[PDB]
Amino acid sequence: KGLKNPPGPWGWPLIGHMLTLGKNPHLALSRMSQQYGDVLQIRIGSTPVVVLSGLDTIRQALVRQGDDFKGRPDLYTFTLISNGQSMSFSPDSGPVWAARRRLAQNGLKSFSIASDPASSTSCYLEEHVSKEAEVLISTLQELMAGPGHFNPYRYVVVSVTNVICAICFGRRYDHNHQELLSLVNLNNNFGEVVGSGNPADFIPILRYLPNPSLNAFKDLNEKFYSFMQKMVKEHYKTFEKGHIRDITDSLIEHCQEKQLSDEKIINIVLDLFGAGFDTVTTAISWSLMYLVMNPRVQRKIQEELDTVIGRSRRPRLSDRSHLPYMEAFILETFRHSSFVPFTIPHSTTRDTSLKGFYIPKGRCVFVNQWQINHDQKLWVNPSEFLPERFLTPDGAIDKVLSEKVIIFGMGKRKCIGETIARWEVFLFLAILLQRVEFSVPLGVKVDMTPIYGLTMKHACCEHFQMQLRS
Ligand code: HEM
Ligand SMILES: CC(C)=CCC/C(C)=C/COc1c2ccoc2cc2oc(=O)ccc12
Fold first, then answer.
1. Best of 271, 418, 454 to mutate for ligand 2, by most ligand atoms within 8 A of CB?
2. Where do the record's glycosylation annotations fall on this chain?
3. Cβ atoms within 10 A of the Cβ of 244, count?
């Protein structure tokens, strides 16, 4: 009716609610939204923060009022990413950002969904995922002959990285390549530092005290930026104007057809490479954890594969639409884990209101996806892993209910690799489960508790076993 300020609990005058958030902000703020509602206010240090919950309220802000909520706060941790010029994390939300986003979407679309000039049956993504799925199966058979057990993340992260690495740099790597493992599987705390609520972003003194976490984050980005440099120079040395091989070339080509510094056009590939390998690897890793902890669910997926395709040919993307129980499992992996509990923090571009509450310009905003995916109002038993909740009586996907699983964001800042992620996750699982069975013996600890971060990881598990099927 009128205009109010967003409600919220009392906080300490110097540190605010930093202690209320604790180690699991997504859980603390979910309980908090049950009491104060979909639009609430807190403080981290002296910085106010508005936290958005509820499915309709978040759609109202990110979509219907999207231009008001399309900004990024000028946090310190973001200034360390891509030399302070990250497309996704810098405070630039004007036309320069929109142009870079438009370069990334077309680069992805051109080298993921487009038809491969070599094969006629499949596209780029399906070709790459098929190759790595085979190498992944062979690599796991070797481990079953030796130690008899393995850590799936150790080898999934390479297979997933080779896919995005072929789309970006036209290269793949061996599962024991020392350079790669040092890059994608050596002290990778990117998600832990960038996760919404990092005290270093709101308590300035923590940035200058002995901080091993922040030191690892600085080294990690310097290492990734050097890798970008190496791959761009190697591409320039062998660049052919009429033969665009990957996304790096389509960006070099755009630097010649030349607002956008050379650096801001090139480092876009790094945002795609870093996001492509980290989030899909975590998604496939979480999927494997659920398959092992819910053998009932693993066999029902295999039964559908045998019925709809059989073991006479490998699965294909065209079969995704006809495997509803596979989609129900992927949707419930996203929903139950919500391994992306918050979007990247947002920021208001101008004074605005939301559900009658005033939010001034420059206000930092958290978007709680975990709250949606676990809302008691929307789901029956939110804490249980039940893929059947997305299935109709006739065995089809309930389109209305699947669209209430929020993990890719909304509006102007939504994920640009959503389709790639959904096709890549589907194919890897379809090819593997058709041929192998994953399991873990009784009596071994398997900690399913998520570890907070931008992308929530699980405790590593060395007790995975894989067996061929009958
Ligand atoms: C299961 C896999 C993935 C999930 C759950 C996921 C989720 C998200 C989320 C929550 C956001 C932020 C939304 C917001 O800030 O409002 C985002 C943004 C983004 N995603 Fe994804 N993502 C996934 C995979 C990928 C892949 C495969 C790519 C590229 C190949 C990618 C590229 C990006 C980029 C570049 C952004 C930044 C958008 C911007 O800053 O404007 N992501 N993603
Ligand atoms: C997960 C959600 C919701 C959104 C992510 C979107 C983007 C753009 C992530 C950028 O990802 C990375 C970058 C970017 C420059 O440098 C990087 C270095 C990295 O190193 C790592 O270990 C893991 C990732 C990583």
1. 271
2. 33
3. 17
Number of H helices and E strands in the chain, helices first, is: 19, 8
* DSSP-assigned states of every residue in 260-324: --HHHHHTHHHHHHHHHHHHHHHHHHHHHHHHHH-HHHHHHHHHHHHHHT-TTS---GGGGGG-H
Structural method: X-ray
Evaluated on CA atoms 348, 349, 352, 358, the torsion sign reads positive
Counting Cα atoms < 13 Å in the Cβ hemisphere of 193 gives 25
The Å distance, Cα 271 to ligand 2 centre, comes to 6
Pure H helices in 10-75: 18-21, 25-36, 55-59
415 is in an annotated binding site: yes
State the CB neighbour count (10 A cutoff) for residue 368.
Answer: 27
CATH of the domain at 103: 1.10.630.10
Residue 131 is encoded by which pair of tokens? 């190759």
Residue keyed to tokens 């802000």: 61
The residue segments making up the domain with residue 362 are: 1-470
Q: What is the structure's resolution, reported in angstroms to one decimal?
A: 2.8
- 229/285 Cα distance (integer angstroms): 29
Domains contained in the chain, number: 1
